[PDB]
Structure formats: C-alpha cells, structure tokens
Paper text:
We present a 2.2 Å resolution structure of human mitoribosome together with validated mitoribosomal RNA (rRNA) modifications, including aminoacylated CP-tRNAVal. To produce a 2.2 Å overall resolution map of the mitoribosome, we collected five separate cryo-EM datasets. A final set of 509,691 particles yielded a 2.2 Å map. The improved resolution allowed building the most complete available model of the mitoribosome, including several key protein extensions involved in tRNA binding. On the rRNA level, the quality of the map allowed the modeling of 13 rRNA modifications, of which 6 are mitochondria specific compared to E. coli. The mitochondria specific modifications include base methylations m5U1076, m5C1488 in the SSU; m1A2617 in the LSU; and m1A9, m2G10 and ψ39 in the tRNAVal incorporated in the central protuberance (CP)41–43. The density further revealed that the tRNAVal incorporated in the CP is amino acylated. A notable feature of the cryo-EM map is the presence of continuous tubular densities associated with rRNA that we assigned as polyamines, justified by the electrostatic and hydrogen-bonding interactions at the amine groups. Thus, in addition to a previously assigned spermine (SPM), we detected one triamine spermidine (SPD) in the SSU, and a diamine putrescine (PUT) and three SPDs in the LSU. Recently, another putative binding site has been proposed, formed with residues 173, 177, 208, 209, 210, 238, 242, 245, 291, 292, 29545,46, and our map at the local resolution of 2.65 Å suggests the presence of GDP in that site.
The mitoribosome translates mitochondrial mRNAs and regulates energy conversion that is a signature of aerobic life forms. The human mitoribosome translates at least 13 respiratory chain protein-coding mRNAs from the mitochondrial genome. It consists of three rRNAs and at least 82 mitoribosomal proteins, 36 of which have no corresponding homologs in bacterial and cytosolic ribosomes. The mitochondrial rRNA is reduced compared to its bacterial counterpart (2512 vs 4568 nucleotides in Escherichia coli), tRNAVal has been incorporated as an additional constituent, and protein components are extended (~18,075 vs 7536 residues in E. coli).
Residue numbers in the entry:
A (entry chain X): 87 to 245
B (entry chain D): 61 to 298
Write the structure that this text describes.
Amino acid sequence: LGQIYANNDKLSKRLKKVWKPQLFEREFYSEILDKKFTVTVTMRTLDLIDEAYGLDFYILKTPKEDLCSKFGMDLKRGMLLRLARQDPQLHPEDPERRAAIYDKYKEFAIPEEEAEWVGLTLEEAIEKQRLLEEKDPVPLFKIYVAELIQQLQQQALSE
Amino acid sequence: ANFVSWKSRTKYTITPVKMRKSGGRDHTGRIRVHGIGGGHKQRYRMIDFLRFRPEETKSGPFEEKVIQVRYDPCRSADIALVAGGSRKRWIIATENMQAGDTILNSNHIGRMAVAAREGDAHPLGALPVGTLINNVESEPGRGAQYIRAAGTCGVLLRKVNGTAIIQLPSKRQMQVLETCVATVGRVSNVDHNKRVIGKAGRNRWLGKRPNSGRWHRKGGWAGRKIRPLPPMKSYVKL
RNA sequence: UCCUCCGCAUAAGCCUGCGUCAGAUUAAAACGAACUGACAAUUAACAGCCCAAUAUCUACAAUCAACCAACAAGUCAUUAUUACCCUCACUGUCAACCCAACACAGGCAUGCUCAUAAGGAAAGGUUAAAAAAAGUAAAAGGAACUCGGCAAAUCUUACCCCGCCUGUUUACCAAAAACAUCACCUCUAGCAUCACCAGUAUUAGAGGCACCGCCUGCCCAGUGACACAUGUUUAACGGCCGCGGUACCCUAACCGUGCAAAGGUAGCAUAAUCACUUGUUCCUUAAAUAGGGACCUGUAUGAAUGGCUCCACGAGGGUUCAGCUGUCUCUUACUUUUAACCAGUGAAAUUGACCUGCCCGUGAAGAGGCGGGCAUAACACAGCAAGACGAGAAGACCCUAUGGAGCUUUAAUUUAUUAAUGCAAACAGUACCUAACAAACCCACAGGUCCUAAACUACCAAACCUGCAUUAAAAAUUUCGGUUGGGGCGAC
RNA sequence: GCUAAACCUAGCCCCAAACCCACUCCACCUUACUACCAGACAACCUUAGCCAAACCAUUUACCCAAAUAAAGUAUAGGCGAUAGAAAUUGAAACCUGGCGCAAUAGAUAUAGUACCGCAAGGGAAAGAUGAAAAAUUAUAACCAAGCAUAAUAUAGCAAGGACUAACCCCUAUACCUUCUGCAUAAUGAAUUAACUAGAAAUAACUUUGCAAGGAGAGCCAAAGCUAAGACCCCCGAAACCAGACGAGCUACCUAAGAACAGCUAAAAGAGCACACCCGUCUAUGUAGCAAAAUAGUGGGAAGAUUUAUAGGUAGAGGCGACAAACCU
RNA sequence: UAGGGAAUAGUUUAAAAAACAUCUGACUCAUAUUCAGAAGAUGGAGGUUCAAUUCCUCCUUCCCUAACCA
Ligand SMILES: [K+]
Ligand SMILES: [K+]
Ligand SMILES: [K+]
Ligand SMILES: [K+]
Ligand SMILES: [K+]
Ligand SMILES: [K+]
Ligand SMILES: [K+]
Ligand SMILES: [K+]
Ligand SMILES: [K+]
Ligand SMILES: [K+]
Ligand SMILES: [K+]
Ligand SMILES: [K+]
Ligand SMILES: [K+]
Ligand SMILES: [K+]
Ligand SMILES: [K+]
Ligand SMILES: [K+]
Ligand SMILES: [K+]
Ligand SMILES: [Mg+2]
Ligand SMILES: [Mg+2]
Ligand SMILES: [Mg+2]
Ligand SMILES: [Mg+2]
Ligand SMILES: [Mg+2]
Ligand SMILES: [Mg+2]
Ligand SMILES: [Mg+2]
Ligand SMILES: [Mg+2]
Ligand SMILES: [Mg+2]
Ligand SMILES: [Mg+2]
Ligand SMILES: [Mg+2]
Ligand SMILES: [Mg+2]
Ligand SMILES: [Mg+2]
Ligand SMILES: [Mg+2]
Ligand SMILES: [Mg+2]
Ligand SMILES: [Mg+2]
Ligand SMILES: [Mg+2]
Ligand SMILES: [Mg+2]
Ligand SMILES: [Mg+2]
Ligand SMILES: [Mg+2]
Ligand SMILES: [Mg+2]
Ligand SMILES: [Mg+2]
Ligand SMILES: [Mg+2]
Ligand SMILES: [Mg+2]
Ligand SMILES: [Mg+2]
Ligand SMILES: [Mg+2]
Ligand SMILES: [Mg+2]
Ligand SMILES: [Mg+2]
Ligand SMILES: [Mg+2]
Ligand SMILES: [Mg+2]
Ligand SMILES: [Mg+2]
Ligand SMILES: [Mg+2]
Ligand SMILES: [Mg+2]
Ligand SMILES: [Mg+2]
Ligand SMILES: [Mg+2]
Ligand SMILES: [Mg+2]
Ligand SMILES: [Mg+2]
Ligand SMILES: [Mg+2]
Ligand SMILES: [Mg+2]
Ligand SMILES: [Mg+2]
Ligand SMILES: [Mg+2]
Ligand SMILES: [Mg+2]
Ligand SMILES: [Mg+2]
Ligand SMILES: [Mg+2]
Ligand SMILES: [Mg+2]
Ligand SMILES: [Mg+2]
Ligand SMILES: [Mg+2]
Ligand SMILES: [Mg+2]
Ligand SMILES: [Mg+2]
Ligand SMILES: [Mg+2]
Ligand SMILES: [Mg+2]
Ligand SMILES: [Mg+2]
Ligand SMILES: [Mg+2]
Ligand SMILES: [Mg+2]
Ligand SMILES: [Mg+2]
Ligand SMILES: [Mg+2]
Ligand SMILES: [Mg+2]
Ligand SMILES: [Mg+2]
Ligand SMILES: [Mg+2]
Ligand SMILES: [Mg+2]
Ligand SMILES: [Mg+2]
Ligand SMILES: [Mg+2]
Ligand SMILES: [Mg+2]
Ligand SMILES: [Mg+2]
Ligand SMILES: [Mg+2]
Ligand SMILES: [Mg+2]
C-alpha cells in the first residue's frame, strides 16, 4: 500500500497504488506428515521451496518472520512434534522408511516440551496454559483428614 | 438491508404462490431498476418449462390432457393446466390449445419426420423443416428459455450433423443439438401486441411507475442504425 | 338563557397529571385547584403473552354470489404416521391525558351516535368617540370602480391563446402554458437461481415526443454513434443561400453568375415568436395601445428538441352579451369586535446623553442642537403620521477580495478506479513435408548411371488471477490577470 | 427606606511520588437491566483536509524511546515555501511542594445532573450567622445602577465664567471609530457590576564580570567573551476534510390493513355532493391562536385516491410524474 | 457611438485567368443556338520597393456585430 507519481514525475499528481502478488493454487506433499496440502502460494514460495530441497526443509528452516503464515507455523509445529516424539504413526507398517525420514531431518529436532509451543499466538498460548492449570478444587474434607492423621502420629511419638 | 427473496419454495406445486414485489430495489435496498412499483397483487403459478418430464416411475413418450387454459398475471402468454397419470402441472398454452385436447410429450427421433400437431413437444430432430416452434431450450434437458412470450414463434430452418438451426423471434439464427425439445405452434394470445393501455392509470395497475421528468438531450446513440443481423449463435461444441 | 364545532369508546402516545385530608403555595384575573405534603387507587371474562416432529396436500376470486359481464387475476382449506393425561400463571386496566417551548383557534387512526340521553359558555364592570375589524340594510343609477368586476351580489352568453384529457410540482411568496400521461418513434439486449425475473424479443431496459385527425419535407459535408472495403445513421447533435438584370412604377414566370451537405418544403403567421409595432383592413365601443376575422417576406415562423386542425376538459391567461350588485357616482344607518373609563394581572422591539420649538442662512453638500431672527409659565389625557435621513435585518442591487460554493465544458492536471484490448506471467501438448521425365547408356521387369539426391521445423494452452502498457468510460483536484472618471464592452 | 451590598470556604490547577485493575443476594446483548430450548454472522485493509507557499497544481514541522553537544551542519526541496539527519558526545535524578485559583476565578461539575435534541450530541445555574439555634425579637451601621424620602416653571450637549441669588446674563456644534474632511441625518453604545486584547529571535544598545582571551567540555574570539535588562494583541466568516448520528418530518418503495353517505348514469383515472384529501382567490393575522394560522370562497372526493401500523434506501449518498423538489 | 470585413472588364467569379454581356464575321429564308474573331479591369489618395491586385496608411460607399447591469 503506497503512492506513486503519475508518469514517474514528482511534479505530477500523487496517486494511490496497491501492488498485489500473483497467487497460485498448488499441491504440496510433506514427507514428515505424509499428507498432501492444497496451498495458495506465490512464485517466490516455489523458488524458496526449490532452494530448500522440499517443503519440509522450507518449513523447518524458515524463521517465523520470513514464513509470514500462521498455517506455515502450524505445519512447523506438526513436523517438529513428530520429530520430537519420533512418532510411529508415520508409515506405521514401514519402520525402516519412517527412520530414514526422521534421519533426513534430524538437525531440526527439538525437545517435545518446546515443540508444543512453536507457532502459537499469545491468545492460543494463554488458552493452552489455562487448560493445563484448570483443575477442580480439592474438597477440604480430604485435606483435613490429612492434617489430623499426620498430627495424631506426631502425638504418639511424644507419648 | 433485510431483503429476502420470495423465491424460497423448493417443491413444485400448482397452487398459486404468494409473491413479493421488489419496487426495482436490489438486496441492498437501493433502487437498481427504475420504473417499477405498486400494481395489483399477484400470485405466482409455477410453470413447468421441461415439457418432457416423465413421471417418477415412468419413462418414454407420454400424453397429457388439457384441463383448463386461463389468464396468467405474471406473463403475457396464457397457461394451460395439463394432467397425465397422477400428475398435474402448469405449461404455456399454444394459440389453439383448449380444454379437452390431448398433447404428446415424446423424446423420440425417428428416421422419418413426424406430422407436427400444434401443442405437441418433440425433439427438433424429429420435426419437419419449416415447422413453427416455441419454448425452445438451448441444450438438451435445460428447459425452455426462448420463444415464451405471447404470440411468439420460431421456425426450424436446417438440420445438419445432428444439430438444428432455428430462427429466433428477433430473426437471429440459433444452432442447437437435434435432441433439444421444442413445442409446435405459436404461443397463445396472438393479439397481445394490439392491446391499448388507454390511460395512465392502467400502467400503474401493471406495476409501472411514471418516467422521470428530467429532460435528456439525445446523443450519438440515437438515430436509426442499420446493422447486419448478428452471426448465428451456436450452443453446440465441436 | 344560549352553544353543540361535538360526544362515548378503542388503538397509539403519555405515566398519577382537578380522588380524600392537610396546607393559602396559585389559574396569564380570582379564596376552585391542574401547585405542595401525606393517604388512597386500576382486581379478568376484554386485551396481550401461543402451537411436537417428518413427509404430504392446497387449478376453479371478491362483489347479498344468485342471474349478468369482466380484468388490474385476487385475504382465509390438508392428509399420513409418530409423540402427547394438564390445566386457568404472568402482564395492560387511573386521569381533565398525546405531537406542537404554553391549560396553543394547529396536528391526530378506527367504531358508534347524525344531533344528541353525551359535551359545553361568545359578555370582569361600564361607556357607546375617532381610526380599525366582522356583519346587516340602502333612494336614483347599475362597472361610470379598477391593472382586472378584486370583493360583494346575482348566478348567465359567446369566443380566443396554451395544454389533449384525470393526474403531478416549488411543505413556508409561483398550481401554471411547467412535469407526467394514453399514443407514436429511436436505441440496447439471445438470457436463468438475490434487482431486471422465478421474466425470455407480442419480452426487458435506456430515451425522445405527447391521445386522436391531416402530416412529419431537404441534408450524413462537420460533430457523435455505429461499421469496416468503400461506408451507414437525423423521430441522433444539428443545418436547410447569395449578387445583378428583365413586363411604366411594386413584383419578376424569366436571364446571367458564384457558393453549398442541403439551400426552409407543406403548413401557419404582427403569433406567448428581437425590434420596426399601437403594421394594414373588417367586426366590436359614443370613443379601444384590448378582443375577434383576414392581409402578411416570419430576411429572427416552420414540421416527434414536432407542424397544422379539431371533440372533451381547466380554481391556467385574454375578450364579451345579459343580469347582478355599496366596486363606483357618494356615502349613510345599526349590531358585534376593538375601542375609551374602573378593577386585577402584566410583555416586546427600542434607548449616547437630552433642559427634545418655527423661519431663513450655513455646514461631510436635506439642522430641535451652528449664524441671524421669531416664538416661549408648568404638567396630563385622546387623535394624527409631515420629520426625528423613525424601528427591524453588519444591502440580497452594484463594485472590490490573488474570499467561497453550485453548475457546464473542445480550462489545466490525472487515470489511482471501472471496462475493453495488447504483452508478460501462469498453464497442456499436437504435428515435423512431395512437382520427376533417359539427350546418351544400362536394365527381362520395375527402374537405374550421367548433368546435384543439399540445407531447413512448424504450429502452439480457453478462462480466472497478478504485473506493465494502450484506448475509453465515469470522475477527481484546481483556476478563471490587471489598468479603467463604477463594472462590463472597446482599448491598453 | 427599599432593592441590594459584603464574606471564605467547597473544591480545583500545576508538579513530585507511585504502575494500573473489582467483588452481598438478584437482573442485564431479546424491546439491556427480561429465571428456563436446535444453533452455527464474526476482528485487521496507506488518514484526509484546513493551512503555508501571499493563487495553486509537486511540496508544507507533528513524542516514538538519553538531557546536552555535534547542528539548524551534511542533506532534501515548484533547489520555492520550507524540511532536516547521523557518526560521535555524554549529565543529573532526596514524593508529601507552590511569588497557583478562591464561587463570572479554579475542573463543565453542587453535575455530565436539570434542561435541550429522534439520535449522535449539546449542556447549565448556585453557597455564605454564631462557641452554642436544646441561644431566632438574631448578626447594628454606612456603599452600584434602579427607585423612595422629594414631579414640574420661558432658553436649548445642560456645563463653564460667575453672582447677594438655583435659574435668568455671557461663552460653548456629546463621545468613540472612520475619513481628504463628521454637530453630522456615517459606526457603536439603556445603565450598573464583574470579566474582556502585545507572546519571541536576529543583531544592536545599556550596565556588571574577566580579558587576548571569555564561558561550569560543545561555542565564539584580529577586544573579545560571559551574564542581565529591554520590542512583536483580541473577537468574527462563507468554507474544506475525517468519523459518527439521522427516513417517528418528508421523497420513493416493501409487508400486511382501513375508509369512501346521498343523487345521476349505471359503463366510467364519469358529473353533482358529505366524510375525507388538497390549498384557487380575498380579507384578517404579521413577537400571530399559528417559526405558514383563521373566516369565507374554492380543486378532488371508486382512484395515478386518501390513510393507521412495522420495515427499506444516508450525505463523494439517498429519493425525485426535474420544482435543482425532499432527506427532523 | 464602438469594432471586424469587403471593393477586379458593363455583369458575376478566379490567382491579371475564364464565363457570358458587348462589338466582327461565318453558317440560316431570317432570328436564336452553334462555329471562328475582337476588344475591353485591379473604389480613391499617399508612401516603401527596380517592380505592389499581391507590404502599409487615411478617406468614401456598403455589409456584419455590439450598444449592457442596478
Ligand atoms: K397476462
Ligand atoms: K400521562
Ligand atoms: K394554530
Ligand atoms: K390547479
Ligand atoms: K456523419
Ligand atoms: K392579433
Ligand atoms: K386586427
Ligand atoms: K387550471
Ligand atoms: K411621523
Ligand atoms: K464617474
Ligand atoms: K486562496
Ligand atoms: K461552569
Ligand atoms: K465605534
Ligand atoms: K449630514
Ligand atoms: K456623514
Ligand atoms: K447607515
Ligand atoms: K423506515
Ligand atoms: Mg409481470
Ligand atoms: Mg416513456
Ligand atoms: Mg420528458
Ligand atoms: Mg381471553
Ligand atoms: Mg379507561
Ligand atoms: Mg393529514
Ligand atoms: Mg349536557
Ligand atoms: Mg366567556
Ligand atoms: Mg373575550
Ligand atoms: Mg371588556
Ligand atoms: Mg342602492
Ligand atoms: Mg372603466
Ligand atoms: Mg356588463
Ligand atoms: Mg377610471
Ligand atoms: Mg369574485
Ligand atoms: Mg393540463
Ligand atoms: Mg410555495
Ligand atoms: Mg405539495
Ligand atoms: Mg400557492
Ligand atoms: Mg409537457
Ligand atoms: Mg400525436
Ligand atoms: Mg424532420
Ligand atoms: Mg424596370
Ligand atoms: Mg414557404
Ligand atoms: Mg416581435
Ligand atoms: Mg377594459
Ligand atoms: Mg428558427
Ligand atoms: Mg423552434
Ligand atoms: Mg432534433
Ligand atoms: Mg377526451
Ligand atoms: Mg376556461
Ligand atoms: Mg386538474
Ligand atoms: Mg389605543
Ligand atoms: Mg388597567
Ligand atoms: Mg441603534
Ligand atoms: Mg437647512
Ligand atoms: Mg400624545
Ligand atoms: Mg438628531
Ligand atoms: Mg432607518
Ligand atoms: Mg454590509
Ligand atoms: Mg481556499
Ligand atoms: Mg492566470
Ligand atoms: Mg478590475
Ligand atoms: Mg468605464
Ligand atoms: Mg476586452
Ligand atoms: Mg495558499
Ligand atoms: Mg481564491
Ligand atoms: Mg546520535
Ligand atoms: Mg465555576
Ligand atoms: Mg444608589
Ligand atoms: Mg443662552
Ligand atoms: Mg467619504
Ligand atoms: Mg465641524
Ligand atoms: Mg450619529
Ligand atoms: Mg460604514
Ligand atoms: Mg516580546
Ligand atoms: Mg482544497
Ligand atoms: Mg466526507
Ligand atoms: Mg417512514
Ligand atoms: Mg404492497
Ligand atoms: Mg359514494
Ligand atoms: Mg371522478
Ligand atoms: Mg367531481
Ligand atoms: Mg410524488
Ligand atoms: Mg426545470
Ligand atoms: Mg431553475
């Protein structure tokens, strides 16, 4: 979103101008996820994927500020979680193939605890934390039965 | 705005349906077409434009009996209630269609051309060249979209390579597949274009609002223009 | 005694807003109270607040609905199976009331009453001047009034212009000849699931003109539009001629010559038509710049931005017969209101200060206020409108401001936007090219040797989207110099 | 002698410091403040313009993360108006204070209430005893305009010179603004009280300090340099742009309603004529009963009629039988 | 009163030419038509230039336009 001078002459009118990228709908295959996705992409995206030698490398290598896509960040978390867990659901009946794929991308592996939070927005992260911390309150009946028993045992020792 | 089209009914019926006027407004509530408003209230009678619609469990050519021919407020041509088997439906009446007549809805194209009776529905391939037709469809099974107005008729000009060339009321030729079904004869109400409105009020009854009083200078668009008939419109894909 | 314009109810609105008691607060006057404090109140049967599912059904108006005849073609209808044992909750209910700053001559839907069974009071008291308002009556005359018969009275004749007609418009200075309109014509469009339209060229939309009747002549050079090979198109924008001579004079059937796309045709004409103009003549009046009929070169009439007739219609504009009348000659009388006086209550514009005369002269050029004269105890009430360049609105006319805004456009600037087209971008593949000839010789043929038998690929992916261009459409932003015996025009 | 006058508090302003943030029960996104039923709509998208350039058309400063300095320098720009860095440099930092207001001030605030507007929105006014009011026959008085006590006596900007004496005599054309020039019959002003309008650099001058140096890093300097003093108003358009709010009036439309006596003709965008709708002509009214009415007289009144209810179209727009109509 | 344009043979046009009219002849019984010949002009005055219808200036005649706002 910007402005231009008509006929590239500053002394002429200043006009609003919007440059839009050329969008293409293409199908991509993920080795780590063993699934095909119909993603709307640009020719730059195709070039970047070629330079990375595949979609999986592109998704794993590209930082968040360069991916500029929530969907891309969700794919990254999916791939990273499978690498962190060494998930057996990838090619369940072909353990050898599953282990070659995971070896190909071993450089990007990270601890599972960290991978679960990759790509999450602050709102999503807050909701995830809230669910982890949401527990029914403990009835005070149980707590008081513990102080009592613990207290009675100490009294017996003094006797 | 909260405009909802009245055209919500999903099941065919011969019961007159309550319809809502637009006033020339679109769904946004702004005037889209000028000169529309008011007029007598009207109910819509659902017209079946697919003359060859066999009953659910039936197939092949079938006949129907004309029960009544009556006025239709929603169109210039008259409409006829026809009954065949256990089904009743509204259709467009032909010039000489009257109660008690029997009409034939066939899909059969034979080596020889049939003797065309007014009001019968046949495939264009089965009709002699020069037959006056009406309620023609562009593609087979699409349903009649052409030559539906009062007194209108087309003529079957040629039949070549499984296709039919017809002349439209505007005189522009129209190529279609020979399996496209048409109705023989002219549409009812041949003297529609001779009617006289007589007074401004009668136009108001028809739902027409007066023209703007703004004077518009005429421009280059105006004045007689003698142009060649447009090239034959073709719906067949080769 | 007199009004009845109403009245009662519902709806909508309003929300305790003339019930009791206690207060002397008050109603544009007044101690009853609509104001204050307290205390009471409207009780559901009227009304509001409703409904198990799925599929399925629903051609045949209304009008006393019967004859009759229609078009603008219409407000009222189910079944099948499954599910279902229960009961009268909740809310509106008052009034002298709402929208109009007000206890406002205004606004305000429906039912019933059709003059009342309901609802109300035009006069605070007096007097009986002017001017003013609303009425009644008027001698003789009867439009002599006046821009005009406005108003009033009576209640009628004929005609003209414009518009066909009913209808529509500047809420608050214009109701019309303006707009619409039946009719006629031009232009665009071959089509479906939100307008157009649940429509399909006897249709739909964009316009012009204005029923009907007789008609609508000539022109496509220019502009526009359309179409492409020239070109087509005026019921598209628009246009539709000179100079000199010839029958005594007017005039020229006629003749010469130039120009143009065509040279205004039919009609009509002193017109609602630049002036000339109160054109000329007949009719109309005692008298007519009015009106009607004609004559008309209108050198600026004129044919769907329509011409010319003609029924019916008009709170349109004009003329007129007869009658009518206080319009007038020329005013008068009476009643009511207002008025004046008494009592109660009690505004507004306005106001430099005023101890606020007349004449002539003077003066920023029209003096109550200056000069020279004259006049002159003080103070109310009622009239009047010559002055206080009277009051009211920082003149709307006019000019000025490097002040605005609306509108138009071949003003400058621009195409971001919309549409079209081109290229790039993106996207699959289908096909790859033939004009000898022996002259001699060979070869059973079929053909060969010599005198060339090379080289050489073409097409090609429709839309959508994005980028860059081009042309349109529809718009945007901004401006519209100065001088000037006011400005403009001319000139500079 | 009345009307009045007088008052010192309520609180408020600017800083500092400190991060900030509520709760009974019940009700509240449907017509909010409404106990209790089948749904599934969902947020982001360059500010513009006034204005300055003495028009205007490119252009015209707007905290963006450290005071100072580098520096108004490099640089940008109808190279005009004006805009304007960085490298580098590098300080201090103890809330409980006031040469701030004191009822026309200070917050609009006693209150976002009353009141105004359909809505968004606009938006006030004012209080005053004393230790005790369980001391109320208390706390004296004197002061604006306006009046009253107490109308007025030839003549005149109202006074001045005077005079034994108010007047009589003589002299004298209010004020401000605006203009060549105003008693002007040119502007403003009833009067009282309160409120209500000159903001700063560049240099220079004056008076101190130190002095070829001055200055509490930067800067200037061929008597300079440092510090100080001292000069630059108020109210007013028609407009322009952005974002909201409006069709309870009115224009047109949508859904479903309602009204239209009698007579003629009996066919009617037909005639006469009520209700009803409109508003031709005249008078009245003109701060009115009324910010468009009243009386009479008129046009229409089965239709392109009139009308109640709910809904729709919104300002670069809507709507329009084009009157540049109408859109509170 | 202000402003623009125009003036060519007797007539009407052209950029010093044509057309007719005029005069001469031939053809005809004669006239016209026709054919062959002939003549004739740059409104006025002043000036530049070797040379001016063709560069300027004033006047006359005529045409067209404007002559307004309260
Ligand atoms: K019909
Ligand atoms: K109320
Ligand atoms: K009123
Ligand atoms: K009228
Ligand atoms: K043309
Ligand atoms: K005449
Ligand atoms: K005459
Ligand atoms: K009329
Ligand atoms: K007077
Ligand atoms: K003068
Ligand atoms: K300006
Ligand atoms: K205040
Ligand atoms: K003044
Ligand atoms: K004067
Ligand atoms: K003066
Ligand atoms: K004045
Ligand atoms: K509405
Ligand atoms: Mg229809
Ligand atoms: Mg029309
Ligand atoms: Mg029109
Ligand atoms: Mg009930
Ligand atoms: Mg009641
Ligand atoms: Mg009304
Ligand atoms: Mg009574
Ligand atoms: Mg009374
Ligand atoms: Mg009275
Ligand atoms: Mg009285
Ligand atoms: Mg008399
Ligand atoms: Mg007279
Ligand atoms: Mg008479
Ligand atoms: Mg007279
Ligand atoms: Mg009259
Ligand atoms: Mg008319
Ligand atoms: Mg008006
Ligand atoms: Mg009106
Ligand atoms: Mg009027
Ligand atoms: Mg008209
Ligand atoms: Mg006609
Ligand atoms: Mg014509
Ligand atoms: Mg002669
Ligand atoms: Mg003629
Ligand atoms: Mg004339
Ligand atoms: Mg007369
Ligand atoms: Mg003309
Ligand atoms: Mg004309
Ligand atoms: Mg025309
Ligand atoms: Mg008629
Ligand atoms: Mg008339
Ligand atoms: Mg009428
Ligand atoms: Mg009086
Ligand atoms: Mg009195
Ligand atoms: Mg004054
Ligand atoms: Mg004088
Ligand atoms: Mg008096
Ligand atoms: Mg005076
Ligand atoms: Mg005056
Ligand atoms: Mg003025
Ligand atoms: Mg401006
Ligand atoms: Mg200029
Ligand atoms: Mg000037
Ligand atoms: Mg002048
Ligand atoms: Mg000029
Ligand atoms: Mg400027
Ligand atoms: Mg300007
Ligand atoms: Mg820095
Ligand atoms: Mg205050
Ligand atoms: Mg005093
Ligand atoms: Mg004196
Ligand atoms: Mg002057
Ligand atoms: Mg003087
Ligand atoms: Mg004065
Ligand atoms: Mg002045
Ligand atoms: Mg200063
Ligand atoms: Mg601007
Ligand atoms: Mg805006
Ligand atoms: Mg409404
Ligand atoms: Mg409707
Ligand atoms: Mg009736
Ligand atoms: Mg009628
Ligand atoms: Mg009538
Ligand atoms: Mg209307
Ligand atoms: Mg107009
Ligand atoms: Mg106008």
